[PDB]
């Protein structure tokens, strides 16, 4: 037994404002007892549709549900940045309850060059015995970005890690942090810390740096 829920596509990309649709195929008759849910990046899960086409009272009219034979579909008429999330179907006609594999929605938007900022380690961390230098690439699009570290003009390798946020719920851009980790001793031994970033929205690579001697400001 066990009703199989085949959801497609696994990943979906679309321009803001477009109408998109997700399909879920049931291996057995479920009599409209199909449920659609949304899981936002922060983990929040909410009911979108139930009974195949009934809209949750708290959800906007942009969301619609329909059925065609054993095919069930969720349609988002006008994509908004706030719609970035994973979507899953769930049948509740019988037990065990089964979910579709899920659909991840990717939002296409206009190119945006990142704003680049650099942060020296805080005195508080230094007292601890470590030094983290952070380079921030803020609000850019697309995801593709290259960040290189130079300490006193020497290319760095193997001492940094980058992290990227999911597309912003308000503007669908990405932000990225590149953290160069050094021992307090090694940080004190060098002076110029530079972050070089290359991005499609930028005409040429941008370099952001600071002189440990001048501190973070212009001392």
């Amino acid at each position: 037994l066990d009703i199989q829920m085949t959801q497609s596509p696994s990943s979906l990309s679309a321009s803001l404002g477009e109408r998109v649709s997700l399909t879920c195929r049931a291996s057995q008759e479920i009599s409209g007892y199909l449920y659609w849910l949304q899981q936002k990046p922060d983990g929040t899960i909410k009911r979108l549709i139930y009974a195949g086409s009934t809209l949750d009272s708290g959800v906007p009219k942009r969301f619609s549900g329909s059925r065609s034979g054993s095919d069930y579909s969720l349609t988002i008429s006008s994509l908004e940045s706030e719609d970035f999330a994973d979507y899953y179907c769930l049948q509740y006609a019988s037990y065990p309850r089964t979910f579709g594999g899920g659909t991840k929605v990717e939002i296409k938007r206009t190119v945006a060059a990142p704003s680049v900022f650099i942060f020296p380690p805080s005195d508080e961390q230094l007292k601890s015995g470590t030094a983290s230098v952070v380079c921030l690439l803020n609000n850019f699009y697309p995801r593709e970005a290259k960040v290189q570290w130079k300490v006193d003009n020497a290319l760095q390798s193997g001492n940094s890690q980058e992290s990227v946020t999911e597309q912003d719920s308000k503007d669908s851009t990405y932000s990225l942090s590149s953290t160069l980790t050094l021992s307090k001793a090694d940080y004190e031994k060098h002076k110029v810390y530079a972050c070089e970033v290359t991005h499609q929205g930028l005409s040429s690579p941008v370099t952001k740096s600071f002189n440990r001697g001048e501190c973070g400001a212009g001392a």
């Binding site: 899981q39 769930l90 509740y92 037990y95 805080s122 803020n138 973070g216």
Partner: protein, 217 residues
């Protein structure tokens, strides 16, 4: 519509854990509690249900009888107990209430369980101070580095939640030390720095730690 669930927990392998789920309102009436499991980055999996009315329960065969569901009518609370824990059990667990009116009416926020031999450790919170090196136009970037904690998760808010626009809290990264680290950044008016205060509120429930760090220019 907001179900309440117990907080995140670190548990050693071979042990057990019991989590709870209750409505934020008296609610009453006959309802059923459905439970769901989700490994990081993966999909949703049904665990089973507990029917307060008659104490009935049903479980997904995949859990090999390792999950036990119970409930307390008086407190309208449902419980999920997992036994003989393995790393397979590290995941987020959700509860949903159905039958009444709906059909998966309300969902809880989820409870993150981490199975590990490592001990809990609260984070150190360092400021990412705003300066000319993080200022462009009339906008300044600032933040907090939430370093060396275990296990996940940590929550970060700015000014008790009053500041949300422009906040970017990065995914935690596992360092070579076996501890997690992440930064939370936000952009604010460059002219506000002299008057407005900016404080990051960091909570690490697994170690019962909460720190508020004022970020100075």
């Amino acid at each position: 519509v907001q179900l309440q669930q117990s907080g995140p927990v670190l548990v050693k392998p071979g042990g057990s854990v019991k989590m709870s789920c209750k409505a934020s309102e008296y609610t009453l009436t006959s309802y059923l509690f459905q439970w769901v499991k989700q490994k990081s980055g993966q999909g949703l999996e049904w665990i089973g249900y507990i029917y307060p009315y008659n104490g009935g329960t049903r479980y997904n065969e995949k859990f090999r009888g390792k999950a036990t569901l119970t409930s307390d009518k008086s407190s309208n609370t449902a419980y999920l107990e997992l036994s003989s824990l393995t790393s397979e059990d590290s995941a987020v667990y959700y509860c949903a209430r159905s039958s009444m009116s709906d059909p998966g009416a309300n969902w809880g926020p989820g409870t993150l369980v981490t199975v590990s031999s490592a001990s809990t450790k609260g984070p150190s919170v360092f400021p990412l101070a705003p300066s000319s090196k993080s200022t462009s136009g009339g906008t300044a970037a600032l933040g907090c580095l939430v370093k060396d904690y275990f296990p996940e998760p940590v929550t970060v808010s700015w000014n008790s939640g009053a500041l949300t626009s422009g906040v970017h809290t990065f995914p935690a990264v596992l360092q070579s030390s076996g501890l997690y680290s992440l930064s939370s950044v936000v952009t604010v008016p460059s002219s506000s720095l002299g008057t407005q205060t900016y404080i990051c509120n960091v909570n690490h429930k697994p170690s019962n730690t909460k720190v508020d760090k004022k970020v100075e220019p």
